[PDB]
Design a protein around this ligand. Structure first.
Ligand code: FAD
Length: 383
């Protein structure tokens, strides 16, 4: 609510395409969150017409409710490159749109929980450094002393060591996906809001239509990017998508001239991230019952105790978001053997970060192209 500011770039509303639902589209995308939008953009670049159908408003669910960090820290081999390349593409994004998405290369310091955690993060960095798997330089390393002290300036606790993802990204949920949606519209993606996809029709084993509440659109190619609803949508087509719900709370507070900047993660559940306008995202837990109102207030109190720079900061907004996560915590970016011409791009807790690459992979899978990354760890049939 209060985090969105009407009549500014933080308005948080992009209108759907006007007029009647088109009779045909080369690809129909279900869902106008980041995954549907980014996939649509990728497909239009390949010369295909794209229509997105969205049951509510553009970017109305996970893709405007996120914490806002783009990180590869601790990612397993299955998703490391998805994140590493995702960040690299986010670093190109303001230049690609020519409008500020709020993406910033910010840097992130995470103090380990204990000696065991420090052993584990050191091994993780060492192993990745020995085989990055990309020519994009890796910029994560352990820091101490002056460099650490500068990143944690004004901290009450004498923190001694941290993992520093120097090129961690930041993006703000009041802006990023909305800028991407407007860009998609400018590129010719047509996006119909208040327009739920109900199902499909087929002819001779080929998709013929996406059936919406506003009528049918002719197509033989479908991307399911329905966020938490992807399981439900696929169940109506007799296909099981294993996801389970997860929930996370978020807060936004006003800035301070003495706040340290950056992205910080500390023992005692202290997490904050400076937004592009100098406000700060924070929460009692940012990586998966929701915290109650006393816990949320207490989270701000311990933030302020650790960083007195925030003592006079005002609570701008406080909200919660629903995710849907696969059993192994990795995305589902997959063909569906039951429906040739249909692909799924969903089931991720890191979709903002991953989206530029999962969009490409989704399109590759749809079109039968040599895929950008190994698709096996994202298959629907891995469980
Ligand atoms: C609280 C929270 C914090 C997060 N923090 C981060 C972070 O710091 N960094 C990061 O990278 N990621 C983060 N994530 C994850 C990221 O926000 C999601 O992975 C990503 O937004 C998912 O995008 P999506 O397009 O799949 O889903 P959504 O944005 O939820 O979009 C799916 C859309 O599909 C529509 N839809 C569903 N069914 C239908 C239908 N039948 N017909 C038409 N439309 C339909 C929905 O209305 C919705 O708009 C966070 C998520 C949450 C909830």
């Amino acid at each position: 609510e209060g985090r969105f500011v009407p009549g500014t770039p933080r308005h948080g509303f992009v209108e759907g395409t006007e007029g009647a639902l088109p009779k045909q589209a080369d690809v129909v995308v279900v869902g106008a969150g980041i995954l549907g939008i980014m996939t649509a953009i990728n497909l239009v670049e390949r010369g295909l017409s794209v229509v997105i159908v969205e049951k509510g408003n553009i970017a109305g669910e996970q893709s405007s409710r996120f914490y806002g960090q783009a990180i590869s820290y601790k990612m397993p081999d299955e998703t490391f490159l998805l994140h590493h390349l995702g960040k690299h593409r986010w670093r190109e994004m303001n230049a690609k749109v020519g409008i500020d998405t709020t993406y910033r290369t910010q840097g992130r310091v995470e103090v380990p929980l204990d000696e065991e955690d420090l052993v584990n993060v050191r091994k993780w960095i060492d192993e990745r450094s020995k085989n990055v798997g990309s020519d994009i330089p890796f910029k994560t390393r352990i820091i101490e002393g002056a460099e650490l002290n500068q990143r944690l300036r004004g901290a009450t606790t004498d923190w001694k060591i941290a993992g520093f993802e120097e090129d961690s990204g930041s993006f703000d949920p009041e802006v990023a996906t909305f800028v991407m949606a407007e860009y998609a519209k400018k590129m010719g993606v047509r996006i119909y809001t208040q327009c739920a996809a109900r199902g499909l029709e087929t002819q001779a084993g080929v998709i013929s239509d996406v059936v919406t509440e506003k009528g049918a659109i002719k197509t033989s190619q479908v991307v399911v990017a329905g966020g938490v609803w992807s399981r439900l949508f696929m169940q109506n087509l007799n296909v099981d998508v294993p996801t389970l719900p997860a929930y996370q709370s978020q807060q936004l507070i006003s800035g301070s001239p003495t706040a340290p900047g950056g992205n910080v993660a500390l023992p005692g559940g202290i997490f904050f991230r400076e937004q592009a306008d100098g406000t700060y995202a924070t929460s009692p837990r940012v990586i998966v019952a929701l915290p109650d109102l006393p816990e949320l207030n207490a989270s701000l109190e311990k933030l302020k105790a650790e960083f007195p720079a925030f003592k006079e900061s005002k609570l701008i907004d406080q909200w919660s978001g629903a995710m849907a996560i696969a059993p192994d915590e990795n995305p589902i970016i997959s063909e569906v053997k039951e429906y040739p011409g249909l692909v799924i791009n969903t089931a991720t807790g890191w979709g903002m970060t991953e989206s530029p690459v999962s969009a490409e992979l989704t399109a590759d899978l749809l079109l039968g192209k040599k895929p950008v990354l190994d698709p096996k760890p994202f298959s629907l049939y891995r469980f």
